[PDB]
Design a protein around this motif. Structure first.
Motif, PDB file in Angstrom:
ATOM      1  N   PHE A   6       8.414  -3.233   6.711  1.00  0.00           N
ATOM      2  CA  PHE A   6       9.562  -4.102   6.488  1.00  0.00           C
ATOM      3  C   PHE A   6      10.861  -3.312   6.525  1.00  0.00           C
ATOM      4  O   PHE A   6      10.984  -2.258   5.892  1.00  0.00           O
ATOM      5  CB  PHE A   6       9.464  -4.836   5.154  1.00  0.00           C
ATOM      6  CG  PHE A   6       8.335  -5.794   5.083  1.00  0.00           C
ATOM      7  CD1 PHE A   6       8.496  -7.105   5.448  1.00  0.00           C
ATOM      8  CD2 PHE A   6       7.102  -5.376   4.626  1.00  0.00           C
ATOM      9  CE1 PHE A   6       7.419  -8.000   5.390  1.00  0.00           C
ATOM     10  CE2 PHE A   6       6.031  -6.274   4.548  1.00  0.00           C
ATOM     11  CZ  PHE A   6       6.210  -7.573   4.936  1.00  0.00           C
ATOM     12  N   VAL A   8       8.369  -4.479  -0.310  1.00  0.00           N
ATOM     13  CA  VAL A   8       8.910  -4.520   1.047  1.00  0.00           C
ATOM     14  C   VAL A   8       9.698  -3.258   1.353  1.00  0.00           C
ATOM     15  O   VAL A   8       9.668  -2.758   2.483  1.00  0.00           O
ATOM     16  CB  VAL A   8       9.735  -5.800   1.302  1.00  0.00           C
ATOM     17  CG1 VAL A   8       8.805  -7.029   1.343  1.00  0.00           C
ATOM     18  CG2 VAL A   8      10.871  -6.001   0.301  1.00  0.00           C
ATOM     19  N   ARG A   9      10.401  -2.704   0.371  1.00  0.00           N
ATOM     20  CA  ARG A   9      11.164  -1.491   0.672  1.00  0.00           C
ATOM     21  C   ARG A   9      10.240  -0.306   0.915  1.00  0.00           C
ATOM     22  O   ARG A   9      10.420   0.433   1.888  1.00  0.00           O
ATOM     23  CB  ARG A   9      12.146  -1.177  -0.448  1.00  0.00           C
ATOM     24  CG  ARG A   9      13.266  -2.219  -0.537  1.00  0.00           C
ATOM     25  CD  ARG A   9      14.214  -1.906  -1.639  1.00  0.00           C
ATOM     26  NE  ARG A   9      15.158  -2.993  -1.850  1.00  0.00           N
ATOM     27  CZ  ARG A   9      15.944  -3.056  -2.913  1.00  0.00           C
ATOM     28  NH1 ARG A   9      15.908  -2.092  -3.827  1.00  0.00           N
ATOM     29  NH2 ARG A   9      16.757  -4.076  -3.090  1.00  0.00           N
ATOM     30  N   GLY A  10       9.224  -0.146   0.065  1.00  0.00           N
ATOM     31  CA  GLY A  10       8.333   0.990   0.189  1.00  0.00           C
ATOM     32  C   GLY A  10       7.523   0.957   1.467  1.00  0.00           C
ATOM     33  O   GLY A  10       7.262   1.998   2.070  1.00  0.00           O
ATOM     34  N   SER A  11       7.113  -0.234   1.891  1.00  0.00           N
ATOM     35  CA  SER A  11       6.286  -0.376   3.076  1.00  0.00           C
ATOM     36  C   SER A  11       7.077  -0.133   4.353  1.00  0.00           C
ATOM     37  O   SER A  11       8.145  -0.732   4.559  1.00  0.00           O
ATOM     38  CB  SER A  11       5.712  -1.779   3.122  1.00  0.00           C
ATOM     39  OG  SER A  11       5.064  -1.983   4.379  1.00  0.00           O
ATOM     40  N   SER A  12       6.509   0.656   5.258  1.00  0.00           N
ATOM     41  CA  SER A  12       7.118   0.876   6.564  1.00  0.00           C
ATOM     42  C   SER A  12       7.070  -0.362   7.454  1.00  0.00           C
ATOM     43  O   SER A  12       7.686  -0.358   8.530  1.00  0.00           O
ATOM     44  CB  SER A  12       6.408   2.042   7.264  1.00  0.00           C
ATOM     45  OG  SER A  12       5.015   1.814   7.296  1.00  0.00           O
ATOM     46  N   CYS A  19      14.730  -3.619   5.365  1.00  0.00           N
ATOM     47  CA  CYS A  19      15.228  -4.362   4.214  1.00  0.00           C
ATOM     48  C   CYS A  19      16.729  -4.221   4.017  1.00  0.00           C
ATOM     49  O   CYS A  19      17.305  -3.144   4.220  1.00  0.00           O
ATOM     50  CB  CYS A  19      14.556  -3.942   2.927  1.00  0.00           C
ATOM     51  SG  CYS A  19      12.749  -4.321   2.914  1.00  0.00           S
TER      52      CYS A  19
END
Ligand code: NA
Length: 213
Positions: free
Chosen positions: A186, A180-184, A188
């Motif tokens: 989401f 979730v952090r790496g993905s744009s 967080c």
């Protein structure tokens, strides 16, 4: 008796029927005394309350249940017309959760879905779910990433859907936090509860979905 049966028995013998706060206090007291879970109200209940109350969700999905503490915690906050769907594969855990909600008087706020998430997430549409407002991911952290992928694939996340995951203190595989952090997609926030000393007792991640492509 299993631990979850013993938690329910303690509630039945000590808590006030129809009183969610009394039920939560009883579970928390008993589990803290047995050293099975320390001060859950302080370590995660207050954060759960903060997130749910800032968003006032009409439809909450809980992925995972054990004794029903989390279900009672969330269901007691839901407005009329709002509801909780609690999905759990283990029928013994689902049964305790049902009885815990019954004792608290919150049974009309909840539907308990007994089955594997791989089988039931693609069937949430049959429960008249279009999109979810909030998803609470409970205990079994290795399921959080594959469950999130299934929610995406089934079109159950809208722009603004909140994921709130418990028990994310240390890295695991599959690594939900990195996903979730790496993905744009989401946005967080991490929460670390220390209680009164300097070691993390519980950690939670809030991940807000930015909407489908
Ligand atoms: Na992100």
């Amino acid at each position: 008796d299993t631990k979850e049966q013993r938690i329910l028995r303690y509630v039945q013998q000590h808590a006030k029927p129809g009183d969610p706060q009394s039920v939560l206090e009883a579970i928390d007291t008993y589990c803290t005394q047995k050293e099975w879970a320390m001060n859950v109200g302080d370590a995660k209940g207050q954060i759960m309350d903060e997130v749910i109350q800032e968003h006032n969700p009409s439809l909450v999905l809980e992925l995972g249940a054990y004794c029903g503490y989390s279900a009672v915690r969330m269901a007691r906050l839901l407005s009329p017309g709002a509801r909780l769907l609690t999905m759990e594969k283990n029928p013994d855990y689902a049964a305790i959760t049902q009885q815990m909600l019954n004792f608290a008087g919150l049974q009309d706020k909840v539907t308990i879905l007994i089955g594997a998430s791989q089988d039931l997430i693609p069937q949430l549409k049959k429960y008249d779910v279009d999109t979810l407002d909030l998803v609470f991911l409970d205990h079994w952290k290795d399921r959080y990433l594959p469950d999130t992928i299934l929610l995406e694939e089934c079109g159950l996340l809208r722009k603004g859907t909140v994921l709130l995951a418990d028990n994310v203190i240390v890295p695991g595989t599959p690594d939900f936090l990195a996903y979730v952090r790496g993905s744009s997609s989401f946005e967080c926030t991490h929460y670390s509860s220390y209680l009164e000393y300097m070691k993390v007792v519980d950690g939670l991640e809030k991940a807000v979905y930015k909407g489908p492509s």
